[PDB]
Structure formats: C-alpha cells, structure tokens
C-alpha cells in the first residue's frame, strides 16, 4: 500500500545549563531508522535499523553534517521565539519540527509536510499545495512574511517531491525484508470474573506490523464502542505492536459478544468468540 | 503554557510465562513538555539497567517514549512503572498486570 | 535523507 518517511526534531532550551537539548529521529512507516542526540558522545547521526547500518561513510557523514546544521538553526530559533513572545530567559521552551513525504502503491509522490510547533502548539505549517503557509498566531505572521519573501516554500517543495520520495524508495528497497513485510496479528481472548455476576472479556492482538489495526466488540452484532475499554496501540520493543479491547459481560452472556480484528496482514477480517 | 499528562502502559513484550525470559515495558505517551522521569520497579525497588527509546512525537505534537528492561517473571515478583511529570501532583505508580 | 537547507524562524 502507501508508504511514508518522516523526520521528527525536538529542541528544548535549558536555562542556566548551556546548550539546548536537540533530538532528531527518522522513520519509514512505523519503523525508526536513524537518530541524533545532542547529549550523546558520538555527535553523529546513527543507525537504528539493521538495513541502514551498512549504508557507508559518505551517507553517515552527510546525514551528520546536515543534522548538525538543523541543530544550529533550532538553537537560534529558540532565541528568536523567546523574543517574538517577549519571554524571560528563566523558562524552558520547546520547538518541534516534523517533515516528510507519502507515496502511493506505485511509489510516486502523494503528499508532503513541513510543520513547526512552539511549546506544544502549532506555529507554522506548509500547506498541502507546498506553496503557501498557515501561521497559527500573531508572532508566526512575521515568519510567514519572511519565508514568503525568501521563497522558502519552493526549496521545501523541491526536497519533498525529490530527495524525500527518492530516498523513501531507496530505503523501502534496501529494507524490503522488514519494511515491505506485513505481520498479521496473533489473536486471543481472556476471561476474568470481576464478580460472579460479571466478567471481563479481553480481545488481544499481538506481534503485528504495521501498527494500523481495528479492534472492536459487538453484542448481537451491535457496536459496543461506548462500553469498550480500548488501549492505545503500543510497541512491543522488537518492531511489532500490540493492542487490546475489553468489555464487561454480565455472566452467562459470553455467547452474545464477538471481537472483530481488521489488519492489512489478515486475508479476511477475524471474528472471535468466547466459546 | 500547554501541559499534557502522560498516558502510561506497563506490560511485557511476550505473553508472561513464569521462568521464561522476557522484556518489561513502560510506554509513556501523549505528554508535554518533554521532561519526564520514568522508573521500572521490582518489588518496589528501582531497577538499575533500564533503557529507553529515542524521543519522538505524535501528529498532535505530544511526546512518547518506551522504557524497557530484560526480566524473567515469576509467580511472586511484583513489577510496576513509576512516572513523574509536571502535570502530576505526585509520581503515578502503575502496577504490571500480566493480562493488561 | 534529511533536507540540505534549513531556514531560520
């Protein structure tokens, strides 16, 4: 199906502690593949997936060089925003940047993104047309006007439709064994009496990839959304994901309930029953 | 300023089987700002060898991290995840339940 | 690969 590449950058000022913290991470779909941490010893972009480890020194030196230039822009940006919002030097502030691209089944360009947040809220974002900006407040208009004058959107559009898509394709090819894989969920149900009158039925999905999944409960074929406890999809730590959905069943009504599992790895959606 | 409370899940990588090696995870997500303290506990004591994932964030800008350690569950040993963040009046302790 | 040019806020 579709694929994406995303880079996530976090910049946190540290009053009276010197340099701001800077962390960068890169993902292809739901698989992390690179990292940079200003606090680590290496001061280099590093691999976090086996299929990129052997990319070679020209690749690693290049990613290291560019990510250090990102770090320097963010160090200055923190001071610029402190000024735009007339903030004191005493407080810690966070800048976040995310950019990347989506490709379709045929792997050609579908969408590009480039967006920033200051202290957890939208600051500026490149619009879908990759030609215009959305400035979230008064301060952000100064950036919008500056970026409009310096033709920043044209430069970002070139990267998003070019390098981004080109390298996403390369990584999908190099990491085929694990990026182009689909691991269907291993599923099971558990039953525990809260009390003799009631029991919890919990429907599990384990060891799946990609993360996208739908887990629902029905009672006599009717959706039980309001009465389902559904946990956020969570990483197992080995590159797979987990999720569960639970309902409280009055004792003796187990047969009325069905759990429904939908995932890209399943040829047909699953219907599970406690029986 | 925006402050979002961490969601916390404590769980094992595999299904728990007494006496079989595994990983204990504590997934913290949906929080802002990024400063967070996460400890894994064994019978109430802080586990020393605990690693964590690289700081990343969701579409809504909130952060997420996975803290993890190797462990071999037993019938009697109790595990937990203890989290501190600016949104919390005191650290939140979430006990590990092998079926959650 | 990350972007080559980064512009200031």
**Which of the 8 DSSP states describes residue B85?**
-
How far is the C-alpha of A196 from the C-alpha of B14, rounded, in Å? Answer: 30
How far is the C-alpha of A158 from the C-alpha of A161, rounded, in Å? Answer: 6
The alpha-carbon radius of gyration of chain B (Å, integer) is 14
Burial of A34: CB neighbours in 10 Å, binned 0-12, 13-18, 19+: buried
Report resolution (Å) to 1 decimal.
1.6
How far is the C-alpha of A94 from the C-alpha of B62, rounded, in Å? Answer: 11
What burial letters (b/e) apply to B49-60, b meaning 16+ CB within 10 Å?
A: ebeebbbbbeee
Q: What six digits make up the tokens of A269? A: 């959606």
When CB atoms are compared, the residue of B4, B32, B54 closest to A23 is: B54
Instruction: Judge B/C contact: 3 or more CB pairs < 8 A.
Output: no
* Residues near A55 by beta carbon (within 8 Å), at least 6 away in sequence: A47
Q: Report the alpha-carbon angle A23-A25-A30, nearest 5.
A: 150
HSE-up of residue A155 (Cα within 13 Å, Cβ side): 11
**CA dihedral of C3, A12, B27, A120, whole degrees rounded to 10:** -90
Q: What six digits make up the tokens of A89? A: 């030097």
Nearest partner of A26 among B95, B98, B54, judged by Cα: B54
What residue ranges define each of the domains in chain A, with the CATH number in brackets? 1-181 (3.30.500.10), 182-270 (2.60.40.10)
Nearest partner of A83 among A8, A143, A171, judged by Cα: A143
Task: Give bridge partners of residue A118 from the DSSP assignment.
Answer: A95, A121
Domain that holds residue B18: 1-100
Burial of A207: CB neighbours in 10 Å, binned 0-12, 13-18, 19+: middle
The total of other beta-carbon atoms located within 10 Å of residue A64's CB is 17
Size of interface A-B (CB pairs under 8 A): 70
The alpha-carbon radius of gyration of chain C (Å, integer) is 7
* Residues near A199 by beta carbon (within 8 Å), at least 6 away in sequence: A191, A192, A193, A248, A249, A251, A254
How far is the C-alpha of B53 from the C-alpha of A25, rounded, in Å? Answer: 10
The CATH number given to whatever domain includes residue B94 is 2.60.40.10
First to last CA, chain B: 33
Chain B interface disruption, residue of A237, A243, A246, most B CBs within 10 A:
A237
Q: CB–CB of B13 and A236 under 8 A?
A: yes
**Count of domains observed in chain B:** 1
Nearest partner of A235 among A264, A209, A204, A261, judged by Cα: A209
How far is the C-alpha of A60 from the C-alpha of A42, rounded, in Å? Answer: 12
How far is the C-alpha of B14 from the C-alpha of B11, rounded, in Å? Answer: 9
Q: CB–CB of C4 and A156 under 8 A?
A: no
When CB atoms are compared, the residue of A37, A190, A238 closest to B13 is: A238
Subunits in contact with chain A (3 or more CB pairs closer than 8 Å): B, C
Helices (H) and strands (E) in chain A, counts: 5, 17
């Amino acid at each position: 199906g579709s694929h994406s590449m995303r880079y996530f950058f976090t910049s946190v000022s540290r009053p009276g502690r010197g340099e701001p913290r800077f962390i960068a991470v890169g993902y292809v779909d739901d698989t992390q593949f690179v990292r940079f941490d200003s606090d680590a010893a290496s001061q280099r972009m590093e691999p976090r997936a086996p299929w990129i480890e052997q990319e070679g020194p020209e690749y690693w030196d290049g990613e290291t060089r560019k990510v250090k230039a990102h770090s320097q822009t963010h160090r200055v940006d923190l001071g610029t925003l402190r000024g735009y919002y007339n903030q004191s030097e005493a407080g810690s502030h966070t800048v976040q940047r995310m950019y990347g691209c989506d490709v379709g089944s045929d792997w050609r360009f579908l969408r590009g993104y480039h967006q920033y947040a200051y202290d957890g809220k939208d600051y500026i974002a490149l619009k879908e047309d990759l030609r215009s900006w959305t400035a979230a407040d008064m301060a952000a208009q100064t950036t919008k006007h500056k970026w409009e004058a310096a033709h920043v959107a044209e430069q970002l559009r070139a990267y998003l439709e070019g390098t981004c898509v080109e390298w996403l394709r390369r990584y999908l090819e190099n990491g085929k064994e694990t990026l182009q894989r689909t691991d269907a969920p291993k599923t099971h149900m558990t039953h525990h009496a809260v009390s003799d009158h009631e029991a919890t039925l919990r429907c599990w999905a384990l060891s799946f990839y990609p993360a996208e999944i739908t887990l629902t409960w029905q009672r006599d074929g009717e959706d039980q959304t309001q009465d389902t406890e559904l946990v956020e999809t969570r990483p197992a730590g080995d590159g797979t994901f987990q999720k569960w959905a639970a309902v409280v069943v009055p004792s003796g009504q187990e047969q009325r309930y069905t759990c429904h599992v939908q995932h890209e790895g399943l040829p047909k959606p699953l219907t599970l029953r406690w029986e | 300023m925006i402050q979002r409370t961490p969601k916390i899940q404590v769980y094992s990588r595999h299904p728990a089987e007494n006496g079989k090696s595994n990983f204990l995870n504590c997934y913290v997500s949906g929080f802002h700002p990024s400063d967070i303290e996460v400890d894994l506990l064994k019978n109430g004591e802080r586990i020393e060898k605990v690693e964590h994932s690289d700081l990343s964030f969701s579409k809504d800008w909130s952060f997420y991290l996975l803290y993890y350690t190797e462990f071999t569950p037993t019938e009697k040993d109790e595990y937990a995840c203890r989290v501190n963040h600016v949104t919390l009046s005191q650290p939140k302790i979430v006990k590990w339940d092998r079926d959650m | 690969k990350v972007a080559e040019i980064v512009h200031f806020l």
